[PDB]
Amino acid sequence: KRFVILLDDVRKKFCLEDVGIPTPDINSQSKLILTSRYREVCFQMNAQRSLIEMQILGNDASWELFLSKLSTETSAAVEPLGSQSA
């Protein structure tokens, strides 16, 4: 089958064939996406040529994420625009 395996939060190098997952190759259409905190682990798992860095949130998006976390009355204190308050 043409599978896609999303491998979440790997913390050590492990062998795919020992867990049952075949390593995808160029001849096969299958993909395998793994996430980890360590670039060393992603290099050990042969993902060096397709590495993506998960960067922190932007200045604007970090604020509206903070806004959605506040209660209705608390948000109304820091929501208002046009006027400026401390």
Binding site: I52, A61, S62
Partner: peptide, 13 residues
């Protein structure tokens, strides 16, 4: 919030 740009990078790979 703000995950569109990174998700675009993941799909581009």
């Amino acid at each position: 919030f703000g995950l569109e740009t990174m998700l675009s990078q993941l799909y581009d790979l």
